[PDB]
Amino acid sequence: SMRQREQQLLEFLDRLTSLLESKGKVKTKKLQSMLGSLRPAHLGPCSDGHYQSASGQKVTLELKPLSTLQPGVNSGAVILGKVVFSLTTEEKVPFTFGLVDSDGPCYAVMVYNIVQSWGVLIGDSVAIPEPNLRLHRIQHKGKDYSFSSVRVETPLLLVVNGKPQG
Ligand SMILES: [Cl-]
């Protein structure tokens, strides 16, 4: 049997893994036009060369594909993608969305600590400085999930359509 918290969490992972595989059921033509609309300018101030690192220092960031992210904190990198779906759990944590930055696979992004109003729309550009990639391998209650997520500490770190969120 399952209790309520675990049941809705497994439901969420079911939906998330399905949405990642279908890229939010967004049609190929729409995906290509979304991807075509990505601009270097959408990095916003991450581009600047005077981006203030979370550990204190002023560092320069390099745009890299999602597919090249390594587990853990990807120091000195930034990623830039298009939103193809969003969802959350019954507990409204985390705020989760899928990004594509290429013709290859979609990546989940999980955003924590949303205090004020926040969200993103399908078709938005999102830049994530120094992304923290987690490689989930979950086996629980006869279910099995294997997917990556980028853990975002606060929305304030993100750049959306080239506008810093903080
Ligand atoms: Cl949502």
Curated annotation (Swiss-Prot):
It comes from the Eukaryota. Induction: Induced upon heat-shock stress (at protein level). Phosphorylation by ATM kinase induces nuclear accumulation while interfering with nuclear export, and phosphorylation by CHEK2 kinase enhances nuclear stability. It is found in: Nucleus; Cytoplasm; Cytoplasmic vesicle; Mitochondrion matrix. Residues 27-29 are annotated as: Mediates interaction with 28S rRNA of ribosome-coding tubulin. Cofactor involved in the regulation of various cellular mechanisms such as actin regulation, autophagy, chromatin regulation and DNA repair. In non-stress conditions, interacts with cofactor JMY in the cytoplasm which prevents JMY's actin nucleation activity and ability to activate the Arp2/3 complex. Acts as a negative regulator of nutrient stress-induced autophagy by preventing JMY's interaction with MAP1LC3B, thereby preventing autophagosome formation. Involves in tubulin autoregulation by promoting its degradation in response to excess soluble tubulin. It is linked to Neurodevelopmental disorder with cerebral atrophy and variable facial dysmorphism: An autosomal recessive disorder characterized by global developmental delay apparent from birth, moderate-to-severe intellectual disability, poor or absent speech, and hypotonia. Most patients have variable dysmorphic facial features. Brain imaging shows corpus callosum agenesis, mild ventriculomegaly, simplified gyral pattern, and cerebral atrophy. Interacts with JMY and p300/EP300; the interaction occurs in the nucleus and augments the association between JMY and p300/EP300 in response to DNA damage. Forms a complex with HSF1 and p300/EP300; these interactions augment chromatin-bound HSF1 and p300/EP300 histone acetyltransferase activity, resulting in enhanced heat-shock-responsive transcription. Interacts with PRMT5; the interaction is DNA damage-dependent and promotes PRMT5 interaction with p53/TP53 and subsequent methylation. This is Tetratricopeptide repeat protein 5. The lineage of its organism: Eukaryota, Metazoa, Chordata, Craniata, Vertebrata. The chain holds residues 261 to 424 of 440 of the full protein.
